Design an enzyme around this catalytic site. Sequence first.
Site, PDB file in Angstrom:
ATOM      1  N   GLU A   1      40.116  -4.463-113.664  1.00 36.88           N
ATOM      2  CA  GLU A   1      40.478  -5.859-113.582  1.00 36.88           C
ATOM      3  C   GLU A   1      40.928  -6.449-114.903  1.00 36.88           C
ATOM      4  OE1 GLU A   1      36.809  -7.139-111.726  1.00 36.88           O
ATOM      5  OE2 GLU A   1      37.817  -7.371-109.768  1.00 36.88           O
TER       6      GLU A   1
ATOM      7  N   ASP B   1      41.398  -6.824-100.143  1.00 38.81           N
ATOM      8  CA  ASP B   1      40.861  -6.416 -98.838  1.00 38.81           C
ATOM      9  C   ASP B   1      40.473  -7.672 -98.085  1.00 38.81           C
ATOM     10  OD1 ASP B   1      38.423  -6.171-100.925  1.00 38.81           O
ATOM     11  OD2 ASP B   1      37.638  -6.795 -98.959  1.00 38.81           O
TER      12      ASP B   1
END
Lengths: 237, 237
Positions: free
Chosen positions: A12, A198
Amino acid sequence: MKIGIIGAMQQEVAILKDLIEDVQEVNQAGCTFYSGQIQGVDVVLLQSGIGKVSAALGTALLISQYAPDVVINTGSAGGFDASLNVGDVVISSEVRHHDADVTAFGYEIGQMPGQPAAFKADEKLMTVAEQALAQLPNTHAVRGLICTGDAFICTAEGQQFIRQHFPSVVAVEMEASAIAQTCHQFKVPFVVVRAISDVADKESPLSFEEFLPLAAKSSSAMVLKMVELLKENLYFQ
Amino acid sequence: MKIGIIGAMQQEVAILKDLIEDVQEVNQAGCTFYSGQIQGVDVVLLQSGIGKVSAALGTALLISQYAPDVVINTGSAGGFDASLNVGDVVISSEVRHHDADVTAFGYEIGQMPGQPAAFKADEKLMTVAEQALAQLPNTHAVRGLICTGDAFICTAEGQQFIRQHFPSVVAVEMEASAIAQTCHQFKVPFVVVRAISDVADKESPLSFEEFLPLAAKSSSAMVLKMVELLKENLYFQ
Ligand SMILES: CSC[C@H]1CN(Cc2c[nH]c3c(N)ncnc23)C[C@@H]1O
Ligand SMILES: CSC[C@H]1CN(Cc2c[nH]c3c(N)ncnc23)C[C@@H]1O
């Protein structure tokens, strides 16, 4: 001014890490802090590790030792809002703990005793987020409630519980409410600018690993644009 | 040596606060730090506030700024072991997050990614707790697993889930795993020495109100004995 940027995972923070000039690295209590500049703007990028405790600990070290003027939380998230697709950006209006429950003593669901029921994103930072989005016309975003817990949401039961208690939720993750509560305790403005990896269902473990890089790319592009805007926001500075 | 002591609530810290000589109070980020000496040994007493985020933030500030050699978590708890009545003491063998779930990526229930599944209490600190117990013969105590979450446990369903996933649990509370994980990340020895206010069921809200003072009394008496032993024994330089 000094911008604090926080992400949980190495994946990230990697894109933004590579942009820091004159980078100085500190490792402390499982956290990594990268300090330097982006385009002359002082930045400190924290890689905190996953979950509420790691994020709270890291944020406390960040604020107490580096004194950022603002905090931006970058990274991935599980989408709840119908209109979000994988790769899309999600911006916090406010953040709540989905897994906090002291309703026995009259607190509202998600509210931690000693805290407000929700942690509101800073209005001035929010304006910058909006400006950044306007400069990324290919990007679709949703702003709304982000709910945090110490669980990866991947079941219909998990989804239903969160929607039952927080019907306005647009996304879930595992650090934002810890970052936001910590910022609230220190009185430091924050905003969450994440992106969807997701949709928090039985396919999410696979989707997450497949699309984490995409989510990091999308989130990171927005955060970079915010840094570039903050560079010349002299009233904000 | 310097002993760090952490309690969440006013009542949980009040007894020990009043024993601090040459007391110096610092307020920071919604936490209060009382430093000085109890019976000739340096202590720092943190009133953290309630829950995992506040406890993690506070513990990070405690360790980074005050560098205690050990950390003792004091206060109340909800009893799970059948032998526990209100006022009885619980000593952690180890601590786990009862509300952590990233089993989707192979972790044990309760295990946070990047962490061990349990945070083991320090062997010497457990020994000291056991020595303190021997010097308080009218105190009944159980040593075992303490489980933490951001919820006040007061329902059959809540008890069921925790017992199903952590059948050896002796007590539950809302800060210990945060303290323990933070101590793990900083490599600082910890132990939890709490006392029972309620038995985590439908009667808990009223029991907690009635018996929080008893629990603070019982836990605090143990911690005071432990402070005296640690001053004498040189277990920690
Ligand atoms: C390896 S643990 C997963 C990490 C990435 N996170 C954000 C996130 C994406 N999808 C999520 C979902 N379905 N449920 C909760 N969180 C998330 C949180 C944690 O850092
Ligand atoms: C007002 S919130 C409760 C405060 C006291 N705490 C310890 C505790 C006692 N009984 C408990 C139970 N049944 N479930 C979870 N925690 C506890 C945690 C929190 O600081």
